[PDB]
């Protein structure tokens, strides 16, 4: 009572107040604090062990204490537990000891992912798309969050948007930038609940195809001698030719304008075409073009022209 051991209790306050050690805290010094309660005493020594490293301090007259420790020791501490002990002394030279522990959480980074969808439906920017607004869209994952910033620089132009509630994102980009920059980085940046910044990135690539390729179109003789007689002019004449090369394909439309009249047919599997024409039209119009309309897989279109002349008797 004057000769008895002192009975005390040792408490450690939550580490950095929120019980969480983040990257910035880990990279500096941290103040741990607590109280010694119980019997009255006139001084004391608190010993803390963290990551095998001992820290020590005094206890204040009001029973509190506080000590600077390496964030790196807290971050490295294998079980995320601070071990603590105290010895105190009173005026009569009685002493007392106690122990305590304090667990904490270490969260020094987070992971964020991002993906980017295809650039238009086929991941190809065609001629028409290159003169339009094209949607660039994607989603973010892992620790990335609604409200995060999504950015990309495309042909030197910075485009920005924000992650939506469902973690998708999209932003309108000019076709002409996409026509000129077929590979770029997209990033998502933000901050986790412990305050650590994070960044995720991905590379979007696409191809640019803004033209289809003309082939070769020919027109055969207009009848066997390339001359329209009175008799042939009275009837129907089969006008024929070829259409091959470039993007010309079976099924392509062949268009002929003769004497103000429009005639059409399609290219066949041999690369030939034939169409029935009124003789009266060929009689009035001694020269005309055959025009084949083609397209490539990107959806660009192109006209291939063959020109014809004949005589009339
Ligand atoms: Ca903290
Ligand atoms: Ca420990
Ligand atoms: Ca792509
Ligand atoms: Ca496309
Ligand atoms: Ca680029
Ligand atoms: Ca956040
Ligand atoms: Ca093409
Ligand atoms: Ca003839
Ligand atoms: Ca003509
Ligand atoms: Ca001819």
124 CA from centroid of ligand 3 (Å): 8
* Residue 298, φ and ψ in degrees, nearest 5: -65, -15
221: Cα within 13 Å, side-chain hemisphere:
6
According to the annotation, is 261 in a ligand binding site?
no
| Ligand closest in space to the Cα of 205 | 3
According to the annotation, is 294 in a ligand binding site?
no
309 CA from centroid of ligand 3 (Å): 49
C-beta separation of 206 from 119 below 8 A? yes
According to the annotation, is 36 in a ligand binding site?
no
Residue ranges and CATH numbers for the domains of the chain are: 6-109 (2.60.40.10), 110-212 (2.60.40.10), 213-313 (2.60.40.10)
For 87, the token pair is 């010895």
According to the annotation, is 47 in a ligand binding site?
no
According to the annotation, is 25 in a ligand binding site?
yes
- Please give all residues whose CB falls under 5 A of ion ligand 8, grouped by chain where several chains appear: 223, 225, 227
Name, in order, each residue with C-beta under 8 angstroms of 240's C-beta and a sequence gap of 6 or more: 219, 220, 272, 273, 274, 275
297: Cα within 13 Å, side-chain hemisphere:
6
According to the annotation, is 114 in a ligand binding site?
no
According to the annotation, is 223 in a ligand binding site?
yes
According to the annotation, is 227 in a ligand binding site?
yes
Counting beta carbons within 10 angstroms of the beta carbon of residue 259, is it exposed (0 to 12), middle (13 to 18) or buried (19 or more)? middle
Way the structure was solved? X-ray
| Ligand closest in space to the Cα of 312 | 8
Pairing mode of beta strands 253-258, 149-154: unpaired
Residue 165 to residue 46: CA distance in whole angstroms: 49
| Ligand closest in space to the Cα of 146 | 6
| Ligand closest in space to the Cα of 308 | 10
208 CA from centroid of ligand 7 (Å): 9
257 CA from centroid of ligand 9 (Å): 7
From residue 145, alpha-carbon distances to 36, 142, 160, 185, 203 in Å are 43, 8, 16, 19, 20
95 CA from centroid of ligand 4 (Å): 83
According to the annotation, is 225 in a ligand binding site?
yes
This structure's resolution (angstroms)?
A: 2.0
300 CA from centroid of ligand 6 (Å): 44
According to the annotation, is 289 in a ligand binding site?
no
């Amino acid at each position: 009572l004057n000769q008895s051991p002192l009975l005390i209790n040792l408490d450690i306050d939550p580490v950095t107040g929120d019980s969480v050690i983040n990257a910035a805290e880990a990279g500096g010094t941290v103040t741990l604090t607590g109280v010694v309660n119980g019997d009255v005493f006139s001084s004391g020594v608190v010993t803390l062990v963290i990551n095998g490293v001992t820290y020590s301090t005094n206890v204040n007259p009001n029973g509190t204490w506080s000590v600077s420790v390496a964030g790196s020791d807290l971050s490295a501490d294998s079980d995320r537990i601070v071990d603590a002990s105290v010895v105190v002394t009173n005026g009569a030279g009685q002493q007392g000891t106690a122990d305590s522990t304090e667990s904490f959480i270490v969260k020094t980074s987070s992971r964020a992912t991002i993906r980017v969808n295809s650039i238009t439906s086929d991941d190809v920017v065609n001629a028409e798309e290159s003169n339009s607004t094209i949607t660039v869209s994607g989603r973010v994952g892992l620790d990335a969050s609604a409200g995060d910033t999504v950015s990309m620089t495309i042909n030197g132009t910075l485009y920005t948007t924000v992650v939506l509630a469902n973690k998708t994102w999209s932003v309108g980009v000019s076709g002409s930038d996409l026509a000129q920059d077929n590979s770029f980085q997209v990033s998502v940046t933000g901050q986790d609940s412990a305050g650590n910044p994070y960044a995720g990135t991905t590379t979007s690539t696409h191809t640019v195809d803004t033209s289809a390729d003309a082939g070769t179109v020919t027109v055969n003789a207009i009848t066997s001698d390339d001359v329209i007689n009175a008799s042939e002019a009275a009837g129907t004449v089969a006008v024929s030719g070829t259409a091959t090369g470039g993007d010309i394909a079976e099924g392509d439309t062949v268009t002929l304008e003769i004497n103000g009249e429009t005639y059409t047919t399609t290219v066949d599997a041999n690369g030939e075409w034939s169409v029935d024409v009124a003789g009266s039209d060929l009689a009035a119009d001694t020269a005309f073009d055959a025009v084949v309309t083609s397209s490539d897989a990107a959806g660009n279109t192109v006209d291939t022209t063959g020109s014809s002349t004949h005589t009339v008797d």
